[PDB]
Amino acid sequence: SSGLIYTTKVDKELSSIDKVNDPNINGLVCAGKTHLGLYKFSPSDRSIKCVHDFITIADVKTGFNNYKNCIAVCNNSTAISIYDLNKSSSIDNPLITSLCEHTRSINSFDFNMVESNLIISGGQDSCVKIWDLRSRSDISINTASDSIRDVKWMPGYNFLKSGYKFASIHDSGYLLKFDLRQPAQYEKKLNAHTGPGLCLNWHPNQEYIATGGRDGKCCLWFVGFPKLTINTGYPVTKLKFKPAYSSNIYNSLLGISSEAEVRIYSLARKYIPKHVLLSETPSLGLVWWDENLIFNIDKGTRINGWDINKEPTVLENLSKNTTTWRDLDGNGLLSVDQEIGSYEVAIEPPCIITLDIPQIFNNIRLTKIAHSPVEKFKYLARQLKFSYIVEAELQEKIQTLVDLISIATHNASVYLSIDDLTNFKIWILIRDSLLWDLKWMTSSIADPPWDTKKLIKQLYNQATETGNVVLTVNILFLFQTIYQITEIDIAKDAIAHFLLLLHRYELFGIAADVLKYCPFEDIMGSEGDQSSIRLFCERCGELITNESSKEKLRAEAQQTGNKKIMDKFGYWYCDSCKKKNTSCVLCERPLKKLTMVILPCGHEGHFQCIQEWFLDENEQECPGGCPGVAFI
Amino acid sequence: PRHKYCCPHCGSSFPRCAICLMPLGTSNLPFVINGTNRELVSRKLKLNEWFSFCLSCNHGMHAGHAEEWFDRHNVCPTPGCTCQCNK
Amino acid sequence: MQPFDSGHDDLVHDVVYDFYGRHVATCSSDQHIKVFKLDKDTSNWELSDSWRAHDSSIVAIDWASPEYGRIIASASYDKTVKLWEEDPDQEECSGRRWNKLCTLNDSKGSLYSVKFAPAHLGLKLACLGNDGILRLYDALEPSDLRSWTLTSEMKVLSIPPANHLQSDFCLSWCPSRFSPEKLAVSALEQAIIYQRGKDGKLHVAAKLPGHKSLIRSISWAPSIGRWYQLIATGCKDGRIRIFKITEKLELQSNLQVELLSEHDDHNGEVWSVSWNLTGTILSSAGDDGKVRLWKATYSNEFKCMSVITAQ
Amino acid sequence: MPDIKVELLHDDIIEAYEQEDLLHLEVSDIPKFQTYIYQYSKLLFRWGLPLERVKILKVSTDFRSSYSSPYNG
Numbered sequence A: 001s002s003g004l005i006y007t008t009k010v011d012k013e014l015s016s017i018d019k020v021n022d023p024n025i026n027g028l029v030c031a032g033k034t035h036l037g038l039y040k041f042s043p044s045d046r047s048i049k050c051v052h053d054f055i056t057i058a059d060v061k062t063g064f065n066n067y068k069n070c071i072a073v074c075n076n077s078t079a080i081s082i083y084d085l086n087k088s089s090s091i092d093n094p095l096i097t098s099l100c101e102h103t104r105s106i107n108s109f110d111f112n113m114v115e116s117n118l119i120i121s122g123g124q125d126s127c128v129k130i131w132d133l134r135s136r137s138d139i140s141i142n143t144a145s146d147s148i149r150d151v152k153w154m155p156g157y158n159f160l161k162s163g164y165k166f167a168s169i170h171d172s173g174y175l176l177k178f179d180l181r182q183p184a185q186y187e188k189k190l191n192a193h194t195g196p197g198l199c200l201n202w203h204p205n206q207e208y209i210a211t212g213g214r215d216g217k218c219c220l221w222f223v224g225f226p227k228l229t230i231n232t233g234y235p236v237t238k239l240k241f242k243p244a245y246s247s248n249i250y251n252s253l254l255g256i257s258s259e260a261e262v263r264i265y266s267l268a269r270k271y272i273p274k275h276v277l278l279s280e281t282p283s284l285g286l287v288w289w290d291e292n293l294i295f296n297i298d299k300g301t302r303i304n305g306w307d308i309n310k311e312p313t314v315l316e317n318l319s320k321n322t323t324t325w326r327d328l329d330g331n332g333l334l335s336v337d338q339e340i341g342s343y344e345v346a347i348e349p350p351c352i353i354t355l356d357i358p359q360i361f362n363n364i365r366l367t368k369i370a371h372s373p374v375e376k377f378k379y380l381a382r383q384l385k386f387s388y389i390v391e392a393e394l395q396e397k398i399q400t401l402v403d404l405i406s407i408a409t410h411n412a413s414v415y416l417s418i419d420d421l422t423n424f425k426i427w428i429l430i431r432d433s434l435l436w437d438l439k440w441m442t443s444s445i446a447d448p449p450w451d452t453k454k455l456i457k458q459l460y461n462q463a464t465e466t467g468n469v470v471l472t473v474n475i476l477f478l479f480q481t482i483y484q485i486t487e488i489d490i491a492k493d494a495i496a497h498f499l500l501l502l503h504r505y506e507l508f509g510i511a512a513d514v515l516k517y518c519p520f521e522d523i524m525g526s527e528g529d530q531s532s533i534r535l536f537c538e539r540c541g542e543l544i545t546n547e548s549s550k551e552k553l554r555a556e557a558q559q560t561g562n563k564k565i566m567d568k569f570g571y572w573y574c575d576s577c578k579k580k581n582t583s584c585v586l587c588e589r590p591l592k593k594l595t596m597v598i599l600p601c602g603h604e605g606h607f608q609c610i611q612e613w614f615l616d617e618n619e620q621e622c623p624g625g626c627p628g629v630a631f632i
Numbered sequence B: 001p002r003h004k005y006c007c008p009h010c011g012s013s014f015p016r017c018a019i020c021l022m023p024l025g026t027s028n029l030p031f032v033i034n035g036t037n038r039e040l041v042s043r044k045l046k047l048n049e050w051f052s053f054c055l056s057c058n059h060g061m062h063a064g065h066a067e068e069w070f071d072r073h074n075v076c077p078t079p080g081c082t083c084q085c086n087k
Numbered sequence C: 001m002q003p004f005d006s007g008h009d010d011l012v013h014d015v016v017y018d019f020y021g022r023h024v025a026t027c028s029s030d031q032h033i034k035v036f037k038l039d040k041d042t043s044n045w046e047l048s049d050s051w052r053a054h055d056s057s058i059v060a061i062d063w064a065s066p067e068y069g070r071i072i073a074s075a076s077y078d079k080t081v082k083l084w085e086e087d088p089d090q091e092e093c094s095g096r097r098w099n100k101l102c103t104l105n106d107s108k109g110s111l112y113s114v115k116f117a118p119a120h121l122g123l124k125l126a127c128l129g130n131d132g133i134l135r136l137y138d139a140l141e142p143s144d145l146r147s148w149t150l151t152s153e154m155k156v157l158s159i160p161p162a163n164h165l166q167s168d169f170c171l172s173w174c175p176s177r178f179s180p181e182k183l184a185v186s187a188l189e190q191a192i193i194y195q196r197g198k199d200g201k202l203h204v205a206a207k208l209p210g211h212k213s214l215i216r217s218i219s220w221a222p223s224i225g226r227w228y229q230l231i232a233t234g235c236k237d238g239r240i241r242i243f244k245i246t247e248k249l250e251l252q253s254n255l256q257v258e259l260l261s262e263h264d265d266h267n268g269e270v271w272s273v274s275w276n277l278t279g280t281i282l283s284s285a286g287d288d289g290k291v292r293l294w295k296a297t298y299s300n301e302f303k304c305m306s307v308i309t310a311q
Numbered sequence D: 001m002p003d004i005k006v007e008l009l010h011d012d013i014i015e016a017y018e019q020e021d022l023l024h025l026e027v028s029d030i031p032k033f034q035t036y037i038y039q040y041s042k043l044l045f046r047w048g049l050p051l052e053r054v055k056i057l058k059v060s061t062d063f064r065s066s067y068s069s070p071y072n073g
């Protein structure tokens, strides 16, 4: 990344990483099962070296003040191994002292920032022990609670309660704060996240404790009802504060990690992470060396160091506006009106702006020259006639030209009726070109411009460049088979897009009229019949296909000539069980042409009968003795 | 299944309407079928979205779709069908 | 119609209409999706429901076809895509009115773009994020909406990037019903057109040149009868590029990409571009809060028609 | 609710309101009107129609003076 400075990889096993709390040094410590050592980073070559190698979840936190040359590593469960930094390359052992009091394993510990001799401890025994260096623990408070997950001291930074306070979290989701000067049962018992609370941390300036949890939440609690809540969604395990002054509570940075990534959030914008350091492998721990340096380890066993002032932010790559269209002319046009806020200091809710673009444009035009396209689209959809409906082929072509001339005359008449001359002239040109082709067929290098094919193709191209959808789809219906205008794919795509545009408005009957007489047979779907309904009989259970009746009526209509005999065919009778008719549920009359089926019980009905029973009588039950209330 | 009816054997929905190509038997349609005392009007609007099919050609429609479509035409709306479903 | 204020507490990232132009859904950074319906009376927007969806900022949204139900797919930074379906049973604005169907937790990095395919491909979902691979999810049975299977996984990038935060991945489908399936990918700075071949696997069809910065948006143009198709792309520099695509019938058709325009009237960064349904009037967003409308002139180039600014 | 400012640029309706000519013809639109009109005027003077050549030359010179002597003295 851009903010990456140090990327040194150590092939040994790593479990935790911390730093030496000393300004005049550039060393950082590491951990592991059987590997403890201190690593020195050099900002000149941007590399990390090794200093001295000495050789269950715990810290690798170092000491403070005169005990800054000491580290604590849990060796075996209830083992407190205090090592040394000065006594590394010498005859004397790095180990200083060993402490063991806990019955169970030790989970977390912290060195005090003010009284360097006092070392805290805590594990699954629900005991908080203070160990005195310059002197068995000092004070052991057995709260008899669940297993303690994390113990941290009060940060006595160099910016009375400086190093005499500490907090712990249990598996019962309870936050306990105690005072070292006056221990008691509980100084402040506060609730926490439900289930096992995993981690907590202290604000360096104000009395605020942010607690993580396995539920995926990191709530900021006032310890002077959380003041803040970040639903991270993943079990928070590690968090490290930025060691800087913060007068305002919102003017702070919080690093949240669990697949674990270093996500440096902010306390004024809890919904957007400020800096993300995801590396390439899931992380095991992270640490802040200074206000601008952050160090971490990951599953790739690489010690990595970043500078937060060279790393970019998420906020940047966050879209600030979007635009959508509702229809052709611009009746609906949205654009998000929001103000780009900062990481410092809430956010005013954005106003989503819709505009009637044709209405405002017409108002602007009428104001300037003083010194409804949707209704027109509906009208021209409904009233224009999109549909069309060796000597014999010539006669058929002659009749096709004649009634296409009539259709063009009708389309010009409706355009002249709505007083639109610019499209009236188009259909007059089309009619005159068809008259030219008709007289050329009757009387029987580059083409002239007034030819009946070139003029129609040029008018279609001008229409599809202008955007007049109605005319450019009408020409594609009426003049496709006889005159090859364009590719079949483009024509079918244009028919389909006009149908979808018609469906976008509430004009479905016009879409049905367009689709019924379309010469292209595969516009919407390829399965054939998708409104076809097949029924089984109510008395025998066989499928009502009625092949025998259809065959007999087809033969009879073929013999007698007239096709009205085929109107006797229907699916209201069964030819296998000899069912006579299907009856209405209300009036018990024969039912042949149109039904209204009540859904949950499956009963028939005339339109008038069912509408009478369900609207005029205001009855909510089926009119056939059905307990299922098929109301309205 | 008071608002969405499906086949129990495989889950596939009902045959679509012949006017809007939307599945049949489901309420809360994203549009209002205003087919040809506001409580009565609401009951008519919620009744117009029911299952309805001709018994001579077996082609299904919404009730409001059929009411609005047969007031101007006299042929079944499915392409390739010659059946005057009105009378 | 008059502008209205949403209840979102943070930045709105993607607003997408339904098919019928009466339902609008906004996904925001404060972990909320608010869906509004256009009332017939007084022509004002009214709230339907508001439910939290993900644990991060939601940056993409796309409705499905109304024939498959009221399905909303949202993509956020939590490496997951969740599908949501409206329920008329629950009361409006209660929060239980929407229900999950399937969580697409098949990603290692944060996903950026989710887009729904044209309806003649069935219910197909396109996903693209920080992993550098385009994920296509199909509903092999559209009868059940909780079943989703990954079918196509094409590596649109040669390598994963280093600055993963400085990335934006955008998707746009091709509304041509009878052409072969075309999908637009803007991965980091390169725009790739993907066509489906005879082998059933996706292939690189054509590459859009230029694009000296990050492509922040992409939108294909509905070609109503035109012999050529148009792609609108939006870059980080503020340049709006309209590409002319000509298709002539291993893929069964070759694509010739010819740049038709390049406009820099937005003194900022074009976050979003859009087309109207005719494929003529183009609208673009920007970093200045201004909305510019672009229409084709008498020539083959495009020109600005209005600059809608917000005060 | 903030204020929204919209400024129309190059509106075709406004430009159609801002001219009186039926067409906006130019020199490149009709490339060789001058020679054709001149030669047909000469052929008209070959015939017994001297008024029509004056009419057609007047149309030619009206357009020529629009986009930009033996009869004097």
Ligand SMILES: [Zn+2]
Binding pocket: A537, A538, A539, A540, A541, A542, A574, A575, A576, A577, A578, A579
């Ligand atoms: Zn039977």
Ligand SMILES: [Zn+2]
Binding pocket: A584, A585, A586, A587, A588, A589, A605, A606, A609
């Ligand atoms: Zn009856």
Ligand SMILES: [Zn+2]
Binding pocket: A598, A601, A602, A603, A622, A623, A624, A625, A626
């Ligand atoms: Zn019944």
Ligand SMILES: [Zn+2]
Binding pocket: B017, B018, B019, B020, B021, B022, B061, B062, B065
């Ligand atoms: Zn219907």
Ligand SMILES: [Zn+2]
Binding pocket: A593, B054, B055, B056, B057, B058, B059, B076, B083, B084, B085
């Ligand atoms: Zn019928």
Ligand SMILES: [Zn+2]
Binding pocket: B054, B057, B058, B059, B076, B077, B078, B081, B082, B083
């Ligand atoms: Zn029928």
